[PDB]
Amino acid sequence: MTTREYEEAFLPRRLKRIKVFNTPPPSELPAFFHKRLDNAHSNPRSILKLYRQYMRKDDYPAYDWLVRCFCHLGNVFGFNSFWATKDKQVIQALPSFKFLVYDLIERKHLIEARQVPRLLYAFACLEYRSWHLLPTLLEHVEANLEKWRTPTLANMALT
Amino acid sequence: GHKHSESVLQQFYNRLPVRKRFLKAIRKGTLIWDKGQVKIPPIAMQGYGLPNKLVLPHQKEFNNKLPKFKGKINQLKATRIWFQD
Amino acid sequence: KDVQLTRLLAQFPPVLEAVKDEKKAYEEDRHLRFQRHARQKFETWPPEKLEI
Amino acid sequence: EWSFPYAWLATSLWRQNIWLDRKMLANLAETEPASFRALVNEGKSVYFWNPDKVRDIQDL
Amino acid sequence: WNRNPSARYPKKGNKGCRPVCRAMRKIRKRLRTGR
Amino acid sequence: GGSYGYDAFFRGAAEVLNGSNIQLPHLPENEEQKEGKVYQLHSVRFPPQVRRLGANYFFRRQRAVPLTYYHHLVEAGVHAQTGRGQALCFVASANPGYLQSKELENAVFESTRGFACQLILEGRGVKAYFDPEWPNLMVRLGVGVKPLALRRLAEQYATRAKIFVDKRGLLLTVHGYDKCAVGTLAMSLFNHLQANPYTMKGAHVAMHPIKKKVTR
Amino acid sequence: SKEVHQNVHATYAVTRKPEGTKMGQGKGSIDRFVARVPAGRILFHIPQINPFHPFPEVEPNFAAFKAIAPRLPVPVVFREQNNFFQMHSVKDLIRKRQAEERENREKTARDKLGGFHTD
Amino acid sequence: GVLGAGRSSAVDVACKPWKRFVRKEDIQRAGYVPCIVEKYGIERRLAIHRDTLEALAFDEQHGHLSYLFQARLFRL
Amino acid sequence: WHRGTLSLLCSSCRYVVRKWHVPILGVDCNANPRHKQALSVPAPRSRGIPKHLYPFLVGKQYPRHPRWRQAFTHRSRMGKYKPQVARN
Amino acid sequence: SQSYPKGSFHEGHINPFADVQWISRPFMKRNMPRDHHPLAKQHTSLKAVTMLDEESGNHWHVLDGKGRSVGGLAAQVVRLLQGKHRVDFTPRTAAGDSVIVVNAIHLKMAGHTWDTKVYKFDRKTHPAGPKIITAKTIMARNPAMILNLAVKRMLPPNRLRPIMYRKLFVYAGALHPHWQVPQVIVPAKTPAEVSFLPFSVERADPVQAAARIAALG
Amino acid sequence: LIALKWFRRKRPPMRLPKYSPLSLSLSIQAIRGHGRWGSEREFPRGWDQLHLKDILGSPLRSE
Amino acid sequence: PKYDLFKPLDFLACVKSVHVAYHPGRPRSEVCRQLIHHMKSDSVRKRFPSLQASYQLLGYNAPSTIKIELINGKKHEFQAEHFSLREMQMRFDTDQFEAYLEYMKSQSVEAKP
RNA sequence: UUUUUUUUUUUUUUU
RNA sequence: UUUUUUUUUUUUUU
RNA sequence: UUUUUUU
RNA sequence: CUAAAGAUAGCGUGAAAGCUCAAAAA
RNA sequence: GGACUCCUUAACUUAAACUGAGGAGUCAAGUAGGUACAAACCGUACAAGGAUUAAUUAUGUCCAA
């Protein structure tokens, strides 16, 4: 037999390597990433890496996907979890989180009524406060005051 | 010196800008020279896996699967230990 | 930061006495002295007592 | 001097269709400082490119 | 042991692994292949 | 670095895989702690002395998991104590190991009671008397042999530890506040007070007697 | 009481130059016999089968091979192959039963408190 | 019983296609085992993961190629 | 008892390090002073093989230059033997 | 007198299972450089200062080598000395500028270099051989030499080396004896004011405060 | 002054954080309903997952 | 070798008498049982023969109680329902070590009954 | 864990 | 971690 | 201009 | 308290005694 | 009736720059470059001649450069 090194020792060092496996690429980015998000629910690094990949692949990702990713990130740092406040501060001090919140702020006008409770719960969990979206969320809350359920009203009041 | 011809290995040692004390040790084997520094030779434990930097490229896959030690020398419980050549 | 903290503290001068939690020690032996670089004396040949 | 390595400069120049030998380059560099600075500025524009989207996180 | 003469100094980078008057090259291979 | 050894090159370092599973010093570790472990947050109430440690030990020191700390301070027959009306400190963590460090107990013992040690004396004619008063320690090592002046040690360790001797002079007790100091002192003493294995005339640390020997 | 068997025999002959011969005066006399043992060839083996099936927590015995491996001029490695399959293992069954019991216990504990409905 | 003769032993694993202009070495290096299927049909080429194949092959902690390996029904 | 290796012979042995002239490992035993081992007389080290020579050490080593002169030669390629060539 | 010197590893832990098994220092713990407790005023270091002079054409560069690496510093110094940083560089001549170095005592050395390093000095036809001097001696006697030798061995092996060498100035201390040249270290200045208070003070009820003080007393 | 560029201090940003195996293991344990307070499955504890899912997934009422 | 100078003191060390009184089945009643079993152990019997230990079972719902009297006349009383074995010892460690210190000074630790 | 090798012409290991 | 240190040791696991 | 630690 | 404890794995003595480990409980 | 190296192989102490065979390159009769220091190894769009010009090669990119 022969070794790979031996073979390689007689070829240009910058010569590209052949591909062993090839498959069609994902046609629909939103649908491709929605299924991927189903597996990441405990690892913050996985969520951040998925968001970074989507941001690099597209300049204007889906607003629903961005909201879902933000809620997923917020859910990890729950009240019953063992995470510390320093872990939340260092996460807030990351550039990717700032880019995600900036992307949400850019198209804040696409916020649905049903997505306000989750955003507020994530804000409470992460101890992060903004003056860029909370004023808009309060408008929807007050507008739909006469339609929320009692448990949602209580949770919103507590948060 | 007085000797006409000397071994390359000895010559190498002869060129080391270190004290006599460390020279002797180096010669003996208690110490090694690497990256312009002197440190204790690697320790080979019985049953545990050796460092990935000492095995052959094709042996790394099998070496990585062996047990690894993540404790202190006092906490080590190896039946026999010796320096890896 | 040090300047601002000193200014903040200047507005609240001490009132009550402070409390210490230092190490306890045998204060009685404060008058003793220890000499390190002290040579061994040999006054007389026959030693009556061995001085370590 | 102007925070522009030769490594970058060469590429920048060549990409611009500029065909100037190192002899004239070096002579210019010594005799015509202004000329040299002009070239460096010309090159920098090309070399340094902004992305399709810019985000500001100063207030965030 | 084989350590004094100049026919046993390893190749360093940019030599082709077979400089003039070498024996250790063919000794190690042989050793591995069977002694 | 970048040099293969002969053993790992030729032989391939096969020696490590040539050991037997018999004549072992200790039994193999049982592989019982498998998947299925549930962690919980433990909490312990320590005395108020641990406050002397400060933040540099509870927060600055890096650890795998968080290590919280709180100080419950309360303003001031039979010692009928309860869980209320007294000060203490709460130390909670997910790893039980962090709640058993010797430093936490040392922080209390050093400032409350300290540490102590003892040395036993044996042999015919071996006596440890006292000079007029402290600091002056003399120990007689058998009959006919001159005594040993131990004032140097006491002067060295003044205010850190103290030496006491019983009436009989057969026991050398050491009392201090510093663990290290105490130990050092004790071992220093025992170094020159060590007993002979044959004649058995000297000193020894308690719970560690010396075995006797006989000539053939 | 135990039985052993050899797998390699010395049959290859080798010559040596007698002390007192010139540069070249023909082949020398036979010196000794050696066996050409390539890599992977077996030297010794004990057909004995480990009877202790329900005891996978104990490694095999290789004291006899350890006592001679330093002697050999080659690196050796211990080996022990049997007819034991995964399917026929009691470890799996023990694991299964432990899981089942855990589940049962958990269920019982949840049902006792009455915080949720039954069935 | 556990040791009964009425017990199945078949296995089911996935495979990957063998791309054109691909050598054995390439596949091997990639972390796969090349294989082919040949009787009662056309010749087919497949690749089976090393970590998946070797696990079946070497079913002993201190053993080599098992006898059982060649006595199964692979549902590729 | 200087030795070339270290082993646990007692029931309470501990692998320690002694602050000698040089950092040296050792084994200390409480129940038997004779078991005190100090690794200070190892075997001499050998000269290792550089890593960069790995590619040309292990595996089938094919000849550098191939052989083609024996399979290249022909009468038509030689002026002295070309006229003798006959196609009829 | 009758035994080997006490190394740095004698005062610390040993970790064979790591790159840096033991930390090494030029001096003992109880011997390390220190500053006098009574600071008559606080000082601040300027990192580096530069002086140009068009008329005489002699430029000066004063550096602060406090906590820096010897190798790196030497490397940097070499550049300046050689004058390669200028456009008008002539290898024939010394186109460099004068360099001043301070706080040489504060240098660092990675690895086991403080305890396993020596320096050799050649001798013309000597039977004993070259004179070997340990680095601890050099640190004890003349710290500047540590940098001096590194620079020297870094400079090209030519007749210009002496010239280039002469222009180099290294001092163990903070200040320098030079007259007409700025100091790297200067007395500290008053911090700048702030246009905002980052505190929110809110006093409590005087009656309750007095009651609490009386209770605590 | 430009000549002395080497003496300048620099600090690159933090690309991503780092966590320990136990720190990551505790996260999934908490998510599965084994937080610090107790077993959510055994007893419904505050800020549980199932209740939050329902209330935040169906906040609006039916007309 | 390595000598062990300092050794932690046992819970039942330098103790004159111990009394336990609890209600079986009461929440947080493990302390009482553990203490009882420790008291009525083999090791204890051998190391501290002159120890007076006693337990009582209450026939009515009442809080747990533990009374410990040392050799130096000191007395302490704790609630089993609000403390632990470990925590309890820290409350009276000072008097225990005072008595042990005096005993150490006065006599040798290697003595036997 | 990796970048740092026989870099074994010298300095240097500045990560 | 303590000038404890000719082949003798303590404390803390960093 | 360091990477990795499934759910 | 319940449970478990090899014809006996490592110390010890003069033939003994004594201790420790495995197992069990926690 | 040939000196070094690559593959196979006879002899020898699986020794030696030996002794002798099968088939490719180089030197012999080859320049300058790289390999630290003295033919044999890598590369060459390989030395008619002259000048201050551009290039993917062995191979390098902290300092001597």
Overall number of strands of chain J: 8
Basic shape of chain A: elongated
From the N-terminal CA to the C-terminal CA of chain J, the straight-line distance is: 64 Å
β-sheet strand percentage of chain J: 5-15%
How would you sum up the global shape of chain J? Answer: flat
Helix content of chain J: 10-25%
Give the largest interface: F-L, 33 and 29 residues
As a percent range, the share of helical residues of chain A equals 55-70%
PDB class: ribosome
Keywords: translation, ribosome
Entry title: LSU structure derived from the LSU sample of the mitoribosome from T. gondii.
Chains A, C: DUF6832 domain-containing protein
Sequence-ordered SSE layout with sheet pairings:
This is part of a larger assembly, with twelve protein chains of eleven kinds.
Chain D: H1 6-15, H2 22-31, H3 33-47
Helix pairs in contact in D: 1-3
Chain J: E1 43-45, E2 48-51, E3 60-64, H1 70-82, E4 98-102, E5 118-121, E6 131-134, H2 135-141, H3 145-154, H4 161-166, E7 168-170, E8 185-187, H5 206-216
Parallel strand pairs in J: 3-4, 4-7
Antiparallel strand pairs in J: 1-8, 2-3, 5-6
Chain K: H1 21-31, H2 49-57
Chain J binds five RNA strands through helix 1 and helix 3.
Protein name (chain K): Large ribosomal subunit protein mL43
Subcellular location (chain K): Mitochondrion
Family (chain K): Belongs to the mitochondrion-specific ribosomal protein mL43 family.
Features:
part of a larger assembly, 12 chains, A: mainly alpha, 9 helices, 57% helix, H: 76 residues, 2 helices, 20% helix, globular, RNA-binding, ribosome, Complex, translation
Can you put this structure into words, describing what you see?
The structure is cut from a larger assembly and holds twelve protein chains of eleven kinds. Chain D has 60 residues and is an all-alpha fold. Chain D is built from three helices and no strands. In chain D, α1 packs across α3 (33-47). The longest helix of chain D has 15 residues, at 33-47. The radius of gyration of chain D is 15 Å and the shape is elongated. In chain F, β7 (138-139) and β8 form a beta hairpin. Chain F has five helices and eleven strands; from the N terminus they run βαβαβββαβββαββαβ. Chain F is flat. Chain K is elongated, with a radius of gyration of 24 Å. The termini of chain K are far apart. β1 (50-51) of chain C pairs parallel with β8 of chain F, so a sheet runs across the interface. Chain J binds five RNA strands through residues 2-4, 6, 10-13, 15, 28-30, 68-76, 78-79, 82, 108-111, 113, 149-157. The PDB classes it as ribosome. Keywords: Complex, translation, rRNA, ribosome. LSU structure derived from the LSU sample of the mitoribosome from T. gondii.
